[PDB]
A paper describes a structure:
While mammals use G protein-coupled receptors (GPCRs) for sweet and bitter tastant perception, insects such as fruit flies use a unique family of proteins called gustatory receptors (Grs). To unravel the overall structure of these receptors and their unique structure features that define sugar specificity, we determined the cryo-electron microscopy (cryo-EM) structures of Drosophila mojavensis Gr43a (DmoGr43a) (given its better biochemical behavior than Drosophila melanogaster Gr43a (DmGr43a)) and Drosophila melanogaster Gr64a (DmGr64a) in apo or sugar-bound states. As expected, both DmoGr43a and DmGr64a form tetramer, and are topologically similar to each other, and to Orco from Apocrypta bakeri and odorant receptor 5 from Machilis hrabei (MhOR5)11. The structures of DmoGr43a and DmGr64a can be separated into a TMD with 28 transmembranes (TMs) in total (7 TMs in each subunit, numbered as S1–S7), and an intracellular domain (ICD) containing an “anchor domain”, following the nomenclature of Orco/MhOR510,11.
Structure of DmGr64a is more expanded than that of DmoGr43a, particularly in the transmembrane domain (TMD), which appears to partially account for the differences in their sugar specificity. Larger sugar binding pocket in DmGr64a results from splaying of extracellular half of the helical bundle (S1–S6) that harbors the binding site. In both proteins, two patches of constrictions are formed along the ion conduction pathway, one near the extracellular entrance (Ile 418 and Phe 422 for DmoGr43a, and Val 438 and Gln 441 for DmGr64a) and the other in the anchor domain in ICD (Leu 386 for DmoGr43a, and Glu 399 and Phe 403 for DmGr64a). Intriguingly, the narrowest point at the extracellular entrance is formed by completely different sets of residues in DmoGr43a and DmGr64a, e.g., bulky, hydrophobic phenylalanine in DmoGr43a vs smaller, hydrophilic glutamine in DmGr64a. When the apo and sugar-bound structures of DmoGr43a and DmGr64a were aligned, notable conformational changes could be revealed, mainly tilting of TM helices responsible for sugar binding towards bound sugars.
Author numbering:
A (entry chain D), B (entry chain C), C (entry chain B), D (entry chain A): 56 to 447
Write the structure that this text describes.
């Protein structure tokens, strides 16, 4: 059936494979069989992944202490700490996830029955499209990163170095992927597993935004179903019972949104802060020159993908607010004689109450917030180009 | 009759002559005969104009690559890309324009009948005044640009160059209007058509704002008619039927505004971003010195015209919001016994719902927004004068 | 009687003596005898004062052109242009002032009758206190300016100049009050009248804010009377007629506020822009050193007086909003059985409608606006100290 | 019983011992026996403490005049002036405190009776936890400050000075605690009392925020009791009398909040300004280097404690707003047939009226305000790092 759990679990399982949101029974179609247990195989795999990412973080910290902590090299520590924070926040989210899934299944039951109808693109297809787009873009970004790494390595070896170095996979690992073998003894297995850990770190960084997108789409699906139900009575006379049902379903959707926001406030805050910091860093670094054209294509692809992913997360989150507001226009056109207390309550609720995901209530994810964030980014970049100027 | 189509089509036809909003039957007084067809003479003329503007853009890009992309010379690429984006956005707007015109004619029918009355300046005269002012100011700006070009050319030739150059139209085209003849062979016909293309580019840049102004005036006309209808019952006892009619007409006007905003969101966003960028650029360039007094007059006229055009676009767009709010003051004075549910609904709708054009819902074009934009411009200029300081 | 005209005309007459708001019959106690006529003795005196101030402005412009227009010496042109703009705006305000006074007298009639009561400080005493404080502070500022001028002159003559200059009033006028005698022939009468013109310019600069303060106090007086009337029924059962009367009086006060705001939008905008510019200029200049202690005391007194006058104008204007909001708290405590449609309308009106003076609707003069302006001033000063740093 | 006075007086007495909020009978359990009398032993002790702090302030001012007032050394004058302002504001607060305590006891009486119930952590335990955490953190900060002082003294004496100085308590007082013995003759009693005065100054600086936290917790306690009472009727049919009682209690709580805000506006403004200034100063100073690791730990502990204390004050104040808003979600789920005028009034009151502490109405202490303050701090730091850059 068209349920959020059945539409989200195919990618929740892949995140479990990348050790995110440790749970048992996440592959089962029954939403009541998923539970969080500290003694589980997914718990052990995510514990191993956390240990590996922490080893990466300590190696980066040691390297930066040896070299010197600046505003440029600190981005590695920020990225690794953000991955660790994502791991911890996802552990807590998986702890809270049984109740979240249960309430999501309970409140979404009436939305699978008439007069609500499935749109041209059901929740499964929407989540699949969003997740496939995000996964493909992240895989392409990592592919261009690796390709640029190998190519910069080869052009750094074949000329501009007077040779004196046999091109090998070992030297690749010890040079491009240094600062980790200084603490650990070298081994091809060790190097390949470090590669897998870095890939999983990038995948977790992308999956934070992917999970936010999927949750926002799941909420906007039901909100759009409610909006379509309201629209389907545009030129027809509506009884008080229909308005009572619409108001009750809207109230239940608001309750579910509040519960999901309380559960995901930490994840939303972490994702927003991380995305803002990395967008500012990349916009600061946009003006420098790169040694090879492949580096230019990779860097511009990465910057465009990061900006687009942040904007798409914000727009998908604001889709909830826009969908809740869209019913107001149709409700404002209700005929005079078919106007009752229920319609007044519903209109007051949509007009006055803000209905959107929030970063621990500090801000509400809306299109207004996206425009304000864009302006703040512009101002921060204008200020930081003063710092950037003496370098060039 | 006093219709928006009959008041806007004289300038829509001129934009068609400058290859903007490609449509057929735009000169006919019947709003139902205008349609968008990809195989049409206006489509061919706008395709030629797009090809010419793209040739201009590629020539500018090649010249800037040869010289070097900085923050100063990039304004040419921004202008040409904005012209291209205006062409594309106007193509999509003309695609959506049949439905927009149809709904505009349908909802505005009751506003040509009593108790609504034509003001001292009908929609035709208002649109004519706005369009004539904009066209005359743009023609004057281009006239002073050309006059400053010829004069700077002559004073650059007659002294400060030791002659060694015969004053000719060919050298004018190859020197002031360079960077295009490097890719294309020289020809007087080629030079004159490039001149016409540049003039059309400037006219399109101005006509984006002109079209926004005309649409805003068309909406504010009906909103002011509604406001006057509300005012005409200040000290008279009003039945529920009159309030029902006023609320229904206000709701229909809000529907039309929402439809027009959905159609014109791309145009509004492009115009706002372009105007903000060019205003910031000109305010950054205001402090430098110019070689001749005619250059000073031309530059100050251009800066004043750009600032005034942006402010006038924003004020004309905010006129919709102000006109919708103006009826609240009269409605708040409704007598106690003649207060019903319809008046309460109408007051709640005007007070709570924001009624204005939006840039894809990211911001609402209001006087508050104009003041905020002025403050943002002041802050951006204060930051960018740090960059400007080392030059002088 | 306690009327705004009878409480404001003693200072309106003094402004007439300083050639501000040209009117006839402004000294008469009848509000219907004041009218604006272009052929009048006050019109002639204000025309002479405008000619003199324009002569001052042209002399300053010529001096700055001879020396060089910078960001430091431009403050004189800004001050003189602000005085000229104040003259023109006050001419238009006096043109509109007959209707403003008539409507003010008409709507304020019920406020001089029960159940409204005169507070411990009537409107006459409040306006007198505000005007006397402003006039005394401005006279003290001018007195310290003149004292610092004479003292800096004497210490510049008696030492640090090797004498070679006989101390005289003529040399004072030609040195401290230069840039005006370069265009006009010297004469003791000419010098003394230029002194009087400068004093009148300073008095007009202060009287703009003084007039805004007086208007704000006049409106807040009636709003506080309404608030006290609402408060006087805290623990008593209120009939619908009393609430009808309160709502009607509040609506009439809102109408009067809207009319006064429409009349005084230009004055409010000019005063706010001028005060912001001068506050920013003085906060930029606060860090430099002064040659003598008397100069330090004068400059700090001037800066403190300017900041306090701007803050007091903003607070007096926001007193209208605070007074309108203060009745909401008492109305929210109305007993359940004595709650009717009138109370609901009144509460909705005060809660939703903003009730304050506006700068042509671009912003509303509230305490929130004062805090935002303080933050904007802090940001602007932080940015401009970058410009100020290389000087020291 | 669970009363605010009985839960706050144990720490009010300690503040009295540190000479804050001078009152008599503050240790008595009866809220009506506390009164402010200018002729009292606590008045004499706080007068002595004010004289001592003023002596400290004058000594700091003399030292800075001898050395030179910069943006770095001025922090001592800011701290001492903030302590003096805290003393004066707390004197006025103790003057107003009889009425505040009386109204707090009067309005909180119904909250100690059914259907209101004591939560798992009563007001006494909440206030005790908050005050103990603040006192322990401040004592730890002072302990690390003193430890860093002694250690920096010893390492400055034992090496890097070529000895030539016998390590003694007298030299400690004359070197680390200089600028005060230049005006006063040296004495071990004088030095130890100056130490006690500095400790009391730090304790007053922390107790301003502590008192704000305690007041915010006291208000949020009753607001959370009201929210729980509203929640306890989620799936039960509610009569009009229960809603009348809930609305009346909410109105009384709003009245108490308004009274407390009027009494504590000066304290809130002073605390917010002081915290903002010191947070900006510390974030500006975060990038410099420190001579010893103990200095690093002390400075980072102080910065983290200051940031956390400011954030916790703001969050505790915003807890009132969040608690008032939390009842809206439950009230929005009231069944259709059990919806009456009282519920509509209550929902309108919570939705439209902002319910939070304010800094003299210039701003409202909410989570939105905390996020805005964080953004403002980020912007100010970005601007001020321009000033900080030439030092390093």
């Amino acid at each position: 059936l068209d349920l959020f759990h059945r539409a989200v679990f195919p990618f929740m399982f892949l995140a479990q494979c990348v050790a995110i949101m440790p749970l048992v029974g996440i592959r089962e179609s029954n939403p009541r069989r998923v539970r969080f247990a500290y003694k589980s195989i997914p718990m052990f795999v995510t514990l191993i992944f956390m240990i590996a990412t922490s080893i990466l973080f300590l190696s980066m910290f040691t390297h930066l202490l040896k070299i010197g902590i600046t505003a440029k090299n600190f981005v590695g520590l920020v990225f690794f700490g953000c991955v660790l924070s994502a791991y911890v926040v996802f552990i807590r989210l998986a702890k809270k996830w049984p109740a979240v899934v249960r309430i999501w299944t309970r409140t979404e039951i009436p939305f699978t029955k008439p007069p609500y109808e499935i749109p041209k693109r059901n929740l499964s297809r929407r989540v699949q499209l969003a997740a496939l787009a995000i996964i493909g873009l992240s895989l392409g970004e990592h592919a261009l990163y690796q390709v640029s790494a190998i190519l910069s390595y080869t052009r750094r070896i074949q000329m501009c170095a007077n040779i004196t170095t046999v091109p090998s996979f070992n030297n690749y690992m010890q040079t491009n992927y240094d600062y980790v073998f200084q603490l650990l003894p070298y081994s091809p297995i060790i190097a390949v597993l470090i590669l897998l850990i870095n890939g999983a770190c990038t995948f977790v960084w992308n999956y934070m935004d992917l999970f936010i997108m999927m949750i926002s789409k799941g909420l906007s699906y039901r909100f759009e179903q409610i909006t379509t139900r309201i629209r389907k009575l545009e030129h027809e006379e509506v009884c008080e019972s229909v308005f009572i049902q619409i108001r009750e379903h809207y109230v239940k959707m608001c309750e579910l949104l509040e519960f999901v926001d309380s559960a995901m406030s930490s994840l939303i805050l972490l994702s927003c802060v991380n995305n803002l910091y990395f967008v500012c860093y990349q916009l600061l670094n946009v003006f420098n020159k790169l040694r090879w054209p492949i580096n230019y294509i990779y860097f511009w692809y990465s910057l465009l993908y990061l900006i687009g992913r942040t904007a798409f997360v914000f727009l998908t989150a604001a889709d909830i607010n826009e969908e809740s507001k869209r019913g107001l226009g149709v409700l404002r056109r209700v005929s005079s004689r078919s106007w009752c207390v229920e319609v007044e309550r519903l209109i007051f609720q949509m007009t006055t109450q803000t209905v959107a995901l929030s970063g621990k209530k500090f801000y509400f994810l809306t299109r207004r917030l996206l425009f304000g964030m864009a302006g703040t980014i512009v101002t921060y970049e204008l200020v930081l180009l003063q710092f950037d100027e003496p370098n060039r």
